[PDB]
Amino acid sequence: EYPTVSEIPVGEVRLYQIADGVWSHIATQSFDGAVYPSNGLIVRDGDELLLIDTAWGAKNTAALLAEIEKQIGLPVTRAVSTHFHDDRVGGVDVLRAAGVATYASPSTRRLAEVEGNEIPTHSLEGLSSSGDAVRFGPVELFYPGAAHSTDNLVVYVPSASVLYGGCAIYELSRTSAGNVADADLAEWPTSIERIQQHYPEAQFVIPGHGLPGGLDLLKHTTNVVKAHTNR
Ligand SMILES: NCCOc1ccc(-c2cn(-c3cccc(C(=O)O)c3C(=O)O)nn2)cc1
Ligand SMILES: [Zn+2]
Ligand SMILES: [Zn+2]
Rounded Cα distance between 131 and 129, Å, is: 6
d(CA 130, CA 151): 10
Active-site residue, from 83, 86, 151, 152: 83
Classify 118 as helix, strand or coil. coil
- CB neighbour burial string for 10-34, b if at least 16 within 10 angstroms, e if fewer: eeebbbbebeebbbbbbbbbeeeee
Nearest CA to ligand 1 atom 1: 115
Catalytic residue from among 45, 93, 132, 179:
179
Under 8 Å between Cβ of 229 and 189: no
Amino acid (1-letter code) at residue 117: N
Could you give the domains of the chain? 5-230 (3.60.15.10)
Nearest CA owner, ligand 1 atom 7: 85
Residue 49's DSSP bridge partners are 44, 76
Strand order through the sheet with 204-207: 133-136, 139-142, 154-157, 162-166, 204-207
Scored b (16 or more CB within 10 A) or e, 41-77 reads bbbbbeeebbbbbbbbbbbbbbbbbebbeeebebebb
CB proximity list for 213: less than 8 A, separation 6 or greater: 171, 172, 205, 207, 220
Distance (Å, rounded) from C-alpha 97 to C-alpha 176?
37
Model resolution, angstroms: 1.7
Radius of gyration of the chain (CA): 16
Backbone φ and ψ of 62, nearest 5°:
-55, -40
42 - beta bridge partners?
A: 23, 51
What method was applied to determine this entry?
Answer: X-ray
**Residue from 179, 180, 224 whose mutation best tests the ligand 1 pocket (most atoms within 8 A of CB):** 179
228 is catalytic: no
The whole-angstrom separation of Cα 34 and Cα 210 is: 15
Beta strands 154-157; 139-142: pairing state: antiparallel
How far apart (Å, rounded) are the C-alpha atoms in residues 63 and 164?
Answer: 22
d(CA 84, CA 105): 9
228 annotated to a ligand binding site? no
151 marked among binding-site residues: no
Q: Is 170 in the pocket of ligand 1 (CB under 6 A)?
A: no
